[PDB]
Design a protein around this ligand. Structure first.
Ligand SMILES: [Mg+2]
Ligand SMILES: [Mg+2]
Lengths: 249, 743, 708
RNA sequence: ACGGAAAAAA
RNA sequence: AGUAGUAACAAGAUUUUUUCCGUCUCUUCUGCU
């Protein structure tokens, strides 16, 4: 099975320049060459998106889209064109192609958005089943305190949660770092049972477990409760002269 | 009636309407042309506030160097840079005495972090002067070029991965009599344009390799390149910023790390805190200082700015501060932290890219570089530039100006904060034993001073004492911009305290609008910016609703995604109209797909695809969140073709990237980036965590990939995933790759 | 030593030992016996792991060469540390074996056990019990060999065969005899037993270090010893006694009844520099436009031009003094002729000589490199002169008075919101409806939408039509009080040749705007303009139907991508007004403990001072205050300049000094004359900066009258 | 961990 | 001419701290009720 990447490595080591680079650069030096660039880095993207959507082809998708969508819409809109190049791997794409995929593309049965972004669905279910009280008007004595914008796991700190995520998602690249805690192993086995035969990317699973398990803390002006369900609705519950009485679900 | 908006200050206090004093709705002032004149202004202002010092010729670079410290005392209120060494050492000694065990823990944290820091910590700066090319580059490519020119000249200590070994190579590279670099050139060729029939010059960029001299390499290593700061608010005239090379970039990180560990534990330092944590720390020390004033005592706050900060911060004073903070530490640590003030006391400033010269007879304009302004007759410049060149000509060594006194802007922020906090720490009522005493707050140069005393004469005595003690160390308080009132209102780093820090929404106006990445990312950016300004900067709820409406209007115009029942017409109105007419539950269509606006004050913390998920059609949510969607990138499943699914919607697409320059052929300099990206793309086939976390190791990439291939083939053989012929094929291909790397 | 290890070992063993020594940062030259011990450990692990193969059935067979077979052991020692831990993690996540705390040496697949192999020079039992004390807690198989011809495994149960262990013992006895005959045995036997860091200075950097000191010192180590051996003997007071008395911060007391006004500069009157006519603009409107092609700018332009048919021949009424005015007249005639017969969506104009002059084509000198410009005897520098000073005129105060006024058209239409569920959302909706009732019909909203349309269409034409001369009509769309749409045309913009690559590159354009204002009444406002007289209009007032001449203001202007970007984002001005105004509405709501939105808006009491009259200070309501702050933000965005940034930043300190005086906080300055010179430096020629300076002087006089 | 945006201070 | 302001365009090649967001990848079009 792993003969394909080994033949890719042999083909890339047959060339003398890539062999010189792969034999002289270390694993530590690869970060110095992964961020290497020589062209002019494009700045001010807001203005470029202002004038670039006036162009007919502002999106550069992969070449496989030439087999996924037609070249013309029902109204005759040219959805994609080739690039003026003697190669492959890129095509210029109209936003009518995005609307065509959203109105006439293949309907999937499996979607991964309720699972990967389940924290925002939890916040939506807290907001929907909430309870609003009356508005009191008085001078808010707001004190900037450190509060949890993400609660995390109750049995894990930030470092222990990141160690649990590294043991779950990327277990053969953890180095000589073993989790000493005993809830780390239980949460690791629970997540490994939950994430077997996973069809999504490993970094997507790692970021899902990062927004689930790792707690984040910020300094925010708090007038009232400091629980993690009240920091997420801090813009709604308080202002400068008013207080919204809110109870989550 | 003549309308006057200032008269609202007759009823409303000024700090309660200070957002009207910030004109942050128009374009900030940009700088045209070259930063040569501002660089020569900085050099002349540095050597004119220090002109009574000792001039010496450097034995290594041949440059004229000014030594103004321990010089004559200042005799006027002008900005002077004659800092006394013993006063600086007494202030640092009193700072160590009033904070017991402060320098030891900071030096020990720097000891622990020096052993653990790697070379790619230097790929964190924004841009970097590349001495190999004499050009500004990003930090990663400048570090890569420095490492390649070092290890192609025998300096191969940086192959160990540590930053301190790269710094040993940096210090040892000054011994080479002929450093051989990899420069760039161009080939101009007059080819006609095929759309205007006008003769252009197709300059083609290519790689050249030439040898330097020892003095030329030492000039290029101590060179601070210069440019002009753009889009700066609050200033009528522009100024030059500078960037150091890759030799000085390494030691500056360690000195800044030490001074940051010091500045984190000082109660008077406004660095490195920011935002609401800085405001809470500032308010806590104001509450602590106002509770020290007795029932019969006067307290007065100075809002203070310092005039010409970097023109008077001498690097030898910072050398004394580094050697006094690190007293008791091992000598290698003191030398490693002391390299950077030595490299900044011997620095040269690159003078930009010359000027532009206009022949009125031939109707010509030409960019004359800064290295060519020495053999030009002075009749061609204007009078300001002629005065600047006549004042700067005796400092020019190899196209750069000598800048031994003073600093450039933003170099040592934390160490200067340490010096200012030491001056603030002098005036305790137990150290002084006088009638006046002070405390305060210190940024890089901005400060707020609180002087308590029994009478206003004692307040004036304390102000004079603080001013003259700042003058002893080269800190010149701006008398034009500092002002003193009673305690209760002041300003510090554009934070206005009027019995509590008042809000300022006008400073956060350019963060509104469509950010310009894609559809869903800009929706999240807009709603999070409105929510953040509701929380922090006190954006009111009705103005927040109007900000939601203005963002939705600008977002619907920007991505041409107006509502499906509109009468407007764009390039994508027919597809959005078809999607609007064929959708049963139209309240689940996204704004990027011509749906309604779902946002209000209660749901700014919820993304758009989540908030509309209960209202989406099954067909629409199947097509929108399709895992086979082609607009995003899919990763291939590794050995542990078949690609992974996609979670993002169809609105997380990639916009087109333009990188071509006018008449420029850059296929010689981009092929290195292409081969580097090929090697980094094939490395992740064997190590899938190299994008989540940075991989470590001292072995090469090829040895790591062959070892991972062999151990994965053996695990797949012994676990029952592959066959024996697969294992034999992988091991024989690894043997063939080893035989290719041998011979 | 070192050469014995380079003689009596295989070169691959030396390569593995060198790669494992360089991982710790120690050369074999500084430690030769450690290099010999590492090479001996490597060779013993290699002789343990080699020539042991597992067949297809599973039985471990010993082969003489590598004849399809797999190795029995996995070698862990000799690799990199991260490579070895990757191998250990791959093994431990295939079986159920717990991870070893330390790196082992081999791994036997036949018994599934990690193997630690130590090669000692003491007795084997001593190093065995030392390793068992070091590895107490984990199940790692140990196998210690020594140079004494004896071994010791764990529980004396050897898993390797007898022949390979006999070869190991014979090789170690050969190495012991070779170390005896080289006189190196007891040195290597007593070579056992972390290092420190070091950072020395090379002589070039030492000579740089000697020249980076205070001028009394000549060596870096001398200054280092001085700083390490320094105690304070009162150096600060000793230096303060020697400093002159003329270095002091003498607090002069601040009183705004004693300070002076700002000195506005003296010269010619300030000129209109906006991108369009603000108060003088006359629009041609269509009410409910239902023509074929509604939405397209040129179709709406022609449909608005069809509403006015009083086109007489255009004559130059007010000349541009520095420019050829017949070129402007021919530009307008070419524009009208090309409008009256065209097809398509866009109108690109023919590049005629008068239009080339008006758009500045060919005015740039040709750019060459200095290598091809070496014998040019006329190369003089660019002129970097400061701007000329200008005097304040009354037209900018007239513009700001007209820009705060209500009109009969809803100029800004806000998009829909979500459902209001929370009670604070209903409160904010009521306050937002009050804000939109007071703010949408303002002249500043018309200027916002005019600037947004002009900068958007100018940016699109600049980025898609870089060569052609695009005609961009000045179109806005509004809704009157009847609830019906209206499309207004203010004139046209002929775009230049916009090949802008830098951020500050200027695209020139020509603005031709319709108006009814005579340029001879206030001619100093119109220096940069050429004004024609293009028509006559029957203006019908309440009494008379008069024939007012319709003029056309033609001028050459220019912009850049940054100015167009900040022109497109002018609707955030609506934030900067209303967030201020709501905060005042919030402030009283903290004192009255109720919702003070409706008492502020409905109960019109004229609470806030917003005007100066010949009578005195005039007061208006909160809606007038919101319109005034909206017009202030609009004029800050339109007339943005570095002079405005400098003036606002420097006058903020004087406003804060006046506020500190009014709080009875006893304000004091150190150099008020220098602060006044810093404020008055930024008042040069911008009309908005001059108007804000006059506003500051009027506010100063109002403060001085308020303390009497 | 990479990249982008805004602000502050020189 | 004009933009503009200490110097450029008028075609020819991003220094330090904090906050927030995102994640693997090179042609003829200008329409904000
Ligand atoms: Mg200040
Ligand atoms: Mg300053």
């Amino acid at each position: 099975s792993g003969m394909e990447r080994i033949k890719e490595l042999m083909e890339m080591v047959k060339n003398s320049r890539m062999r010189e680079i792969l034999t002289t650069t270390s694993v530590d030096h690869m970060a110095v060459i992964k961020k290497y660039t020589s062209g002019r880095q494009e700045k001010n993207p807001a203005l470029r998106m202002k004038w670039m959507m006036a162009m007919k082809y502002p999106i550069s998708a992969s070449s496989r889209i030439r087999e996924m969508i037609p070249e013309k819409d029902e109204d005759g809109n040219t959805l994609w064109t080739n690039t003026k190049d003697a190669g492959s791997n890129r095509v210029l794409v109209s936003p009518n192609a995005v609307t065509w995929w959203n109105r006439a593309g293949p309907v999937s049965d499996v979607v991964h958005y309720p699972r990967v972004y389940k924290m925002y669905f939890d916040r939506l279910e807290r907001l929907t089943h909430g309870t609003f009280g009356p508005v009191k008007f008085y001078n808010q004595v707001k004190v900037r305190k450190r509060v949890d914008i993400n609660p995390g796991h109750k049995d894990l700190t930030s470092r222990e949660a990141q160690e649990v995520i590294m043991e779950v998602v990327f277990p053969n690249e953890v180095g000589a770092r073993t989790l000493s805690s005993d809830a780390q192993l239980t949460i690791t086995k629970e997540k490994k049972e939950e994430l077997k035969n996973c069809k999504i990317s490993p970094i997507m699973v790692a970021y899902m477990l990062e927004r689930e398990l790792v707690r984040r803390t910020r300094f925010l002006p708090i007038a009232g409760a400091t629980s993690s369900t009240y920091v997420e609705v801090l813009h709604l519950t308080q202002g400068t002269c008013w207080e919204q009485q809110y109870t989550p679900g | 009636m003549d309308v006057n908006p200032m008269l609202i200050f007759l009823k409303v206090p000024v700090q309660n309407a200070i957002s009207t004093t910030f004109p942050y709705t128009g374009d900030p002032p940009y700088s045209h042309g070259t930063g040569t004149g501002y660089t020569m202004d900085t050099v002349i202002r540095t050597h004119d506030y220090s002109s009574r010092g000792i001039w010496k010729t450097n034995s290594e670079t041949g440059a004229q160097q000014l030594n103004p410290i321990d010089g004559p005392l200042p005799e006027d209120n002008e900005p002077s840079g004659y800092a006394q060494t013993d006063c600086v050492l007494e202030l640092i000694e009193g700072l160590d005495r009033s904070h017991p065990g402060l320098f030891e823990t900071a030096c020990q944290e720097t000891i622990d972090a020096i052993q653990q820091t790697r070379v790619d910590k230097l790929t964190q700066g924004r841009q970097t002067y590349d001495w190999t090319l004499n050009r500004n580059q990003p930090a990663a490519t400048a570090l890569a070029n420095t490492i390649e020119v070092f290890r192609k000249n025998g300096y191969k200590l940086n192959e160990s991965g540590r930053l301190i070994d790269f710094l040993k190579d940096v210090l040892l590279s000054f011994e080479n009599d002929s450093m051989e670099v990899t420069t760039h050139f161009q080939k101009k060729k007059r080819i006609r344009d095929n759309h205007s029939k006008k003769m252009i010059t197709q300059r083609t960029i290519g790689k050249k390799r030439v040898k330097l001299t020892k003095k030329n390499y030492l000039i290029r290593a101590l060179t601070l390149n210069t440019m002009t700061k753009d889009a700066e608010r609050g200033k009528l005239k522009r100024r030059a910023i500078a960037t150091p090379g890759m030799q000085i970039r390494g030691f500056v990180y360690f000195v800044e790390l030490l001074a940051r560990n010091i500045c984190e534990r000082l109660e008077q330092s406004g660095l490195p805190v920011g935002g609401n944590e800085k405001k809470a720390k500032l308010a806590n020390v104001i509450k602590k200082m106002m509770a020290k004033s007795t029932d019969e005592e006067l307290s007065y706050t100075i809002t203070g700015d310092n005039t010409k900060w970097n023109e008077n911060q001498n690097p030898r004073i910072f050398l004394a501060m580094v050697l006094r903070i690190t007293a008791g530490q091992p000598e290698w640590f003191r030398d490693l932290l002391a390299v950077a003030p030595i490299m900044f006391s011997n620095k040269v400033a690159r003078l930009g890219r010359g000027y532009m010269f206009e022949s009125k007879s031939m109707h010509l304009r030409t960019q004359i570089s800064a290295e060519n302004l020495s053999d030009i007759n002075l009749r061609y410049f204007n009078e300001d530039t002629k005065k600047k060149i006549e004042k700067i000509r005796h400092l020019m060594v190899e196209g750069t100006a000598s800048l031994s006194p003073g600093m450039m802007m933003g170099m040592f922020n934390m160490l200067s904060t340490v010096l200012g906090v030491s001056v603030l720490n002098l005036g305790q009522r137990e150290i002084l034993k006088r009638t006046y005493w002070w405390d305060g707050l210190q940024s890089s140069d901005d400060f707020a001073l609180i002087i308590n005393g029994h009478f206003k004469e004692d307040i004036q005595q304390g102000v004079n004492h603080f001013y003259r003690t700042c003058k002893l160390v080269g800190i010149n308080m701006s008398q034009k911009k500092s002002y003193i009132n009673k305690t209760g209102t002041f300003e510090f780093t554009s934070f206005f305290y009027r019995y509590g820090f008042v809000a300022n929404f006008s400073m956060e106006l350019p963060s509104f609008g469509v950010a310009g990445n894609n559809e869903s990312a800009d929706m999240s950016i807009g709603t999070t910016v409105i929510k953040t300004n509701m929380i922090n900067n006190d954006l009111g709820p009705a103005t927040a609703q109007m900000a939601i409406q203005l963002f939705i209007k600008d977002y619907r115009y920007t991505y041409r995604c107006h509502r499906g029942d509109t009468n407007l017409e764009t390039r994508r109105t027919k597809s959005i109209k078809r999607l609007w007419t064929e959708t049963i539950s139209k309240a689940g269509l996204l704004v990027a797909d011509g749906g309604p606006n779902p946002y209000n004050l209660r749901n700014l913390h919820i993304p758009e695809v989540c908030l509309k998920w209960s209202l989406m059609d099954p067909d629409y949510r199947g097509r929108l969140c399709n895992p086979n969607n082609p607009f995003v990138h899919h990763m291939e499943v590794e050995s542990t073709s078949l690609e992974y699914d996609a979670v993002a919607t169809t609105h997380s697409w990639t916009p087109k990237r333009n990188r071509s320059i006018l008449n420029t052929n850059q296929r010689g300099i981009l092929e290195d980036e292409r081969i580097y990206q090929k090697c980094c793309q094939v490395f992740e086939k064997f190590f899938p965590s190299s994008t989540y976390r940075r991989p470590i190791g001292m072995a090469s990439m090829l040895d790591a990939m062959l070892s991972r291939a062999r151990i994965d083939a053996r695990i797949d053989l012994e676990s029952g995933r592959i066959s024996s012929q697969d294992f034999s094929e992988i091991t024989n291909t690894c043997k063939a790759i080893e035989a290719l790397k041998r011979q | 030593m070192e050469n014995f290890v380079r003689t009596n070992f295989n070169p691959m063993i030396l390569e593995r030992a060198e790669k494992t020594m360089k991982e710790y940062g120690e050369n074999p030259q500084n430690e030769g016996n450690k290099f010999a011990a590492i090479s001996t450990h490597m060779e013993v692990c290699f002789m343990y792991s080699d020539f042991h193969f597992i067949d297809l059935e599973g039985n471990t067979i010993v082969k003489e060469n590598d004849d399809m077979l797999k190795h029995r052991f996995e070698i862990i020692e000799g690799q990199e540390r991260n490579i070895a831990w990757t191998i250990v993690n791959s093994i431990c996540n295939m079986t159920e074996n717990s991870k070893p705390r330390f790196l082992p040496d081999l791994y036997d697949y036949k018994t599934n056990k990690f193997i630690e192999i130590g090669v000692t020079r003491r007795k084997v039992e001593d190093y065995y019990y030392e390793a068992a004390s070091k590895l107490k807690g984990e199940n790692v198989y140990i196998h210690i060999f020594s140079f004494d011809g004896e071994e010791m495994a764990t529980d004396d149960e050897y898993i390797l065969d007898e022949e390979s262990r006999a070869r190991i013992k014979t090789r170690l006895f050969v190495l012991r005899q070779e170390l005896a005959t080289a006189g190196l045995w007891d040195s290597f036997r007593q070579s056992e037993k972390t290092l420190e860091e070091e950072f020395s200075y090379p002589p070039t950097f030492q000579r740089l270090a000697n020249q980076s000191l205070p001028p009394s010192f000549k060596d870096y180590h001398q200054f280092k010893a001085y700083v390490s051996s320094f105690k304070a003997n009162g150096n600060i007071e000793a230096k303060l006694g020697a400093m002159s008395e003329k270095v002091n911060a003498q607090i002069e007391s601040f009183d705004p009844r004693t300070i002076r006004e700002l000195e506005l500069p003296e010269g010619k009157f300030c000129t209109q520099r906006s991108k369009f006519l603000l108060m003088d603009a006359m629009k041609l409107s269509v009410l409910n436009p239902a023509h074929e092609g509604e939405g397209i700018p040129m179709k709406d332009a022609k449909a608005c031009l069809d509403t006015f048919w009083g086109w007489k021949k255009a004559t130059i009424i007010k000349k541009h003094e520095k420019g050829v005015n017949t070129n402007y007249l021919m530009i307008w005639e070419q524009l009208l002729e090309s409008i009256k017969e065209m097809e398509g969506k866009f109108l690109n104009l023919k590049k005629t000589n008068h239009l080339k002059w008006g758009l500045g084509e060919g005015q740039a000198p040709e750019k060459m490199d200095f290598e091809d410009c070496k014998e040019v005897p006329d190369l003089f520098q660019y002129k970097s002169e400061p701007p000329e000073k200008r005097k304040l005129a009354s037209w900018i105060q007239s513009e700001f008075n007209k820009a705060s006024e209500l009109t009969n058209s809803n100029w800004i239409e806000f998009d829909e919101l979500g459902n209001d569920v929370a009670p604070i959302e209903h409160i904010a909706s009521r306050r937002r409806n009050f804000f939109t009732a007071e703010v949408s019909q303002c002249r500043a909203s018309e200027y916002i939408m005019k600037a947004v349309y002009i900068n958007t269409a100018l940016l699109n034409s600049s980025c898609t039509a870089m060569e052609e001369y695009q005609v961009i009509p000045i179109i806005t769309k509004c809704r009157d009080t009847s609830g019906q749409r209206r499309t207004n045309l203010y004139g046209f913009i002929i775009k230049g040749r916009s090949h802008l690559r830098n951020d500050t590159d200027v695209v020139n354009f020509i603005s031709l705007e319709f108006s009814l204002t005579d340029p001879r009444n206030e001619i100093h406002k119109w220096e940069k303009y050429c004004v024609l007289e293009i028509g006559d209009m029957e203006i019908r007032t309440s009494i008379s139907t008069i024939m007012k001449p319709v003029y056309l203001y033609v001028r050459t202007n220019g912009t850049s991508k940054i100015k167009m970007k900040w022109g497109m984002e002018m609707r955030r001005c609506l934030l900067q007004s209303l967030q201020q105004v709501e905060s005042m509405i919030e402030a009283e709501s903290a004192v009255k403990e109720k919702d003070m939105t409706e008492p502020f808006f409905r109960n019109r009491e004229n609470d806030w001072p917003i005007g100066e009259s010949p009578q005195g200070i005039e007061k208006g309501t909160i809606g007038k205050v919101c319109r005034v702050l909206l017009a202030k933000s609009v004029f800050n965005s339109i007339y943005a300049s570095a002079q405005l940034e400098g003036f606002s930043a420097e006058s903020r300190k004087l406003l804060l000094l006046i506020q500190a005086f009014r709080d009875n906080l006893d304000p004091g300055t150190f150099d008020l004359k220098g602060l006044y010179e810093a404020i008055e430096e930024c008042i040069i020629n911008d009309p908005w900066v001059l108007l804000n300076a006059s506003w500051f002087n009027s506010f100063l006089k109002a403060v001085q009258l308020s303390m009497g």
